[PDB]
């Protein structure tokens, strides 16, 4: 991603109706760490879900370790809870080469002064002055009155625990709906005039598959024999009708 939010203002985004290369950052090495929780580091493209989330934010390196589905920690319990009703993976890049500078980075205001914890998948941006003491602040800072969201002095010279990281979070959801997202699929090569154990879009059988003299509507995908035995397929990629002998 081009831009990231603070963790408090978690940049929540849902992904739907598409092919998601979930393992892309495992193989590309564009992030320093790729840690998965309930899903595999690789062969992640084999997971089909109804929806996935692909969120983005900037946190400290020690906080990167704290965020995980179902886990506790100051950042996990107060600024954003990542629930365990979902499976997921937390991936992070060292942003000393992007966000850090002398004077700090003011596009990342982290919540420090609170009365309560935020919920699973809950995003917020409030700037209301916080009362630490006994009297109302009414929008004015002072002893026992604080601005709730603040910038960190992230610099190229800080150690890893404090250095900022660009973190992207993958979260996998199942709800009472048809699934709309999965990873890419890989086809094997097509051989026609040989006995083959075939699988076309989930429909299987064993036979010799050659060009058919049948015609079909653009609509249709498979031909059928008695008791719905498949007797023809159209190839999913090649627009040819193939007869199953």
């Amino acid at each position, epitope marked *: 991603a081009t831009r990231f939010a603070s963790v408090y203002a978690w940049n929540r985004k849902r992904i739907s109706n598409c092919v998601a290369d979930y393992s892309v950052l495992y193989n590309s090495a564009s992030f320093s760490t790729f840690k998965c929780y309930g899903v595999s580091p690789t062969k992640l493209n084999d997971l089909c879900f109804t929806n996935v989330y692909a969120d983005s934010f900037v946190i400290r390196g020690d906080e990167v370790r704290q965020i995980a589905p179902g886990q506790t920690g100051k950042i996990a319990d107060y600024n954003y809870k990542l629930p365990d009703d979902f499976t997921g993976c937390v991936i992070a890049w060292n942003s000393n080469n992007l966000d850090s500078k002398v004077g700090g980075n003011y596009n990342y205001l982290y919540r*420090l002064f609170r009365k309560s914890n935020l919920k699973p998948f809950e995003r917020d941006i409030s700037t209301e002055i916080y009362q630490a003491g006994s009297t109302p602040c009414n929008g004015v800072e002072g002893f026992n009155c604080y601005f709730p969201l603040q910038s960190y002095g992230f610099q190229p010279t800080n150690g890893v625990g404090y250095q900022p990281y660009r973190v992207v979070v993958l979260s996998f959801e199942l709800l009472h709906a048809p699934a709309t997202v999965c990873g890419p699929k890989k086809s094997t090569n097509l051989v026609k005039n040989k006995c083959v154990n075939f699988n076309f879009n989930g429909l299987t059988g064993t036979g010799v598959l050659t060009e058919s003299n049948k015609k079909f509507l653009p609509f249709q995908q498979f031909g059928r024999d008695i008791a719905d035995t498949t007797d023809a397929v159209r190839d999913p990629q090649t627009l040819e009708i193939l007869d199953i002998t």
Partner: antibody
Amino acid sequence: EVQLVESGGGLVQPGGSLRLSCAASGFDLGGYSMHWVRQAPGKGLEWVAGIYASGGATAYADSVKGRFTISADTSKNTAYLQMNSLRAEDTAVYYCARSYYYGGFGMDYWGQGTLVTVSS
Amino acid sequence: DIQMTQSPSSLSASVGDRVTITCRASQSVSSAVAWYQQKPGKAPKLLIYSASDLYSGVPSRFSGSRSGTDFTLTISSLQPEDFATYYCQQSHTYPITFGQGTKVEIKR
């Protein structure tokens, strides 16, 4: 590296007073709160007072109200503590320390402190 | 006026051993407690801030976390330079309040 250096320590007669000061170097006072903490021999740390340099607002421990006053000067880049109506009980090393904003953050860097002792 | 309770008042362990010290506030102080080390003749040094964030200049051996309402400091492995009095400071709400200080001894 940042520095804080205490001075103005000394002796006070009972019922008397002493003014302490601390100079900052490597940073401004603006954006920071200057604090004074005392530690009597045999005791732990006791906070006395704090001032927000960019505010002018102050805060005090209940134990020192009516006796201690805190102030700061951003042109000189120094912090001050005025200690009045002192007792033998008030003997302590008085330290200056830095924290951010108006609090909610702990102190990071401390000066080393200067001794003030009260006797007839 | 929020008061501090610490435990143990003293701790004794050998070099390389694991040390845990806890601090409790009488009221909520959120996560704005800081830990300091003090050596005789010296001012306290910030060790850990905002409950669990390690301060630069402090070894990676130091860490900590909140459990229930209490905060725990952990030294994964004591080295000779880690023997000091350990203080907690609550800066969340004024007055800033410090605990007594936990003395950690080196086993001899």
